[PDB]
Amino acid sequence: MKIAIINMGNNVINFKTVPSSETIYLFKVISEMGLNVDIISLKNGVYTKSFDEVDVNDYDRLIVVNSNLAILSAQKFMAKYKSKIYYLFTDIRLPFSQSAYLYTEEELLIKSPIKVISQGINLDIAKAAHKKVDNVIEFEYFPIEQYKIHMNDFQLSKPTKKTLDVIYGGSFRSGQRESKMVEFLFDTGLNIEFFGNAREKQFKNPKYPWTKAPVFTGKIPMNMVSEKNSQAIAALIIGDKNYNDNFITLRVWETMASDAVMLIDEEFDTKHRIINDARFYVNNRAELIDRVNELKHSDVLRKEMLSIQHDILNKTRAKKAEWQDAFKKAIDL
Numbered sequence: 381m382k383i384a385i386i387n388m389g390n391n392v393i394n395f396k397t398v399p400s401s402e403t404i405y406l407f408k409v410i411s412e413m414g415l416n417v418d419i420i421s422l423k424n425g426v427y428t429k430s431f432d433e434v435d436v437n438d439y440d441r442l443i444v445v446n447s448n449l450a451i452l453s454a455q456k457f458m459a460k461y462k463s464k465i466y467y468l469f470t471d472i473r474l475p476f477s478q479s480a481y482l483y484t485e486e487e488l489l490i491k492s493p494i495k496v497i498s499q500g501i502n503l504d505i506a507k508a509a510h511k512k513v514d515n516v517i518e519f520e521y522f523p524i525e526q527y528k529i530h531m532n533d534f535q536l537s538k539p540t541k542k543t544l545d546v547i548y549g550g551s552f553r554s555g556q557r558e559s560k561m562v563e564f565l566f567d568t569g570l571n572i573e574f575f576g577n578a579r580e581k582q583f584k585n586p587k588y589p590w591t592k593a594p595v596f597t598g599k600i601p602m603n604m605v606s607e608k609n610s611q612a613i614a615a616l617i618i619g620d621k622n623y624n625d626n627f628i629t630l631r632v633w634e635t636m637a638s639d640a641v642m643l644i645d646e647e648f649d650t651k652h653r654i655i656n657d658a659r660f661y662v663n664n665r666a667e668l669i670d671r672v673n674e675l676k677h678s679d680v681l682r683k684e685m686l687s688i689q690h691d692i693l694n695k696t697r698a699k700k701a702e703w704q705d706a707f708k709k710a711i712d713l
């Protein structure tokens with residue numbers, strides 16, 4: 381049984397960009413499952429083989445991720461593949477999709493059936509997002525994002541000195557989460573830092589007025605996110621509208637593993653699936669401020685909440701074998 385992983389829109393070579401790093405970490409976890417796997421990309425190197433040096437059909441299972449040469453090559457490669465394509469649906473804004481003088485569609489048209497492995501539990505949302513796909517398509521839920529906590533070298537963050545009140549790391553996401561970012565992170569009167577690719581100048585929509593913004597700092601490597609989260613008393617979990625009561629995102633685990641107390645927007649998880657404890661949830665800005673002040677003022681509460689969230693994380697890690705079994709079942713092995 382031979383498996384190939386391709387990133388449909390980004391080049392994979394090193395840990396320099398985020399889309400390249402998650403493909404390599406996905407590749408690492410699948411390898412640690414005891415599977416023979418290769419990443420196919422633009423060039424040959426320590427982590428990859430080139431599209432030109434392999435025969436797509438030598439692979440029994442083709443896994444496709446997403447996060448222009450990379451886009452044109454992957455399509456030509458997939459267009460020649462004669463079996464089912466397993467698409468990892470990890471971001472609502474990136475459903476599977478078919479992308480001029482240099483191109484013929486008989487060379488780029490993908491006719492294979494596609495199995496969408498949705499990171500969100502609500503398959504109707506995944507189906508609605510893939511409405512335009514002409515292909516034969518099937519859907520299945522798999523919590524792909526747990527890959528980080530199941531890696532062999534995973535470890536919780538240690539207690540660290542606090543220099544911030546609340547931290548959130550991420551990008552602007554085309555303004556898809558602007559109302560939520562402004563509500564929980566702007567005008568709080570607290571010491572907040574927003575790290576990642578966002579900038580203050582992007583927050584320009586007149587519908588969400590604000591006076592003072594959080595401090596914006598640059599991006600950091602994926603493997604340093606929990607350590608960065610750890611410099612704060614609390615770290616925020618918010619999501620796009622279609623992630624609510626649907627997607628558990630990577631930040632949930634990155635935060636849970638950190639030394640920062642995880643504070644979750646109520647609307648993201650109304651049933652309280654993540655942690656069945658109301659102390660970890662906030663409905664709005666007023667509640668976030670009060671919760672952060674309670675945590676800054678009672679070490680007994682902060683330590684208890686950290687202890688509880690680390691316990692939930694360890695409980696989940698304890699099921700690594702079942703998680704690995706389900707992933708193999710999802711890819712028909």
Ligand SMILES: O=c1ccn([C@@H]2O[C@H](COP(=O)(O)OP(=O)(O)O)[C@@H](O)[C@H]2O)c(=O)[nH]1
Nearest residue numbers: 549550551575576599600601602629630631
């Ligand atoms: O400086 C940074 C900021 C974010 N991230 C990664 O980007 C993810 C956030 O992605 P996004 O902003 O799209 O938000 P999501 O939809 O995952 O909540 C984080 O979980 C990190 O893994 C990173 O590696 N470096």
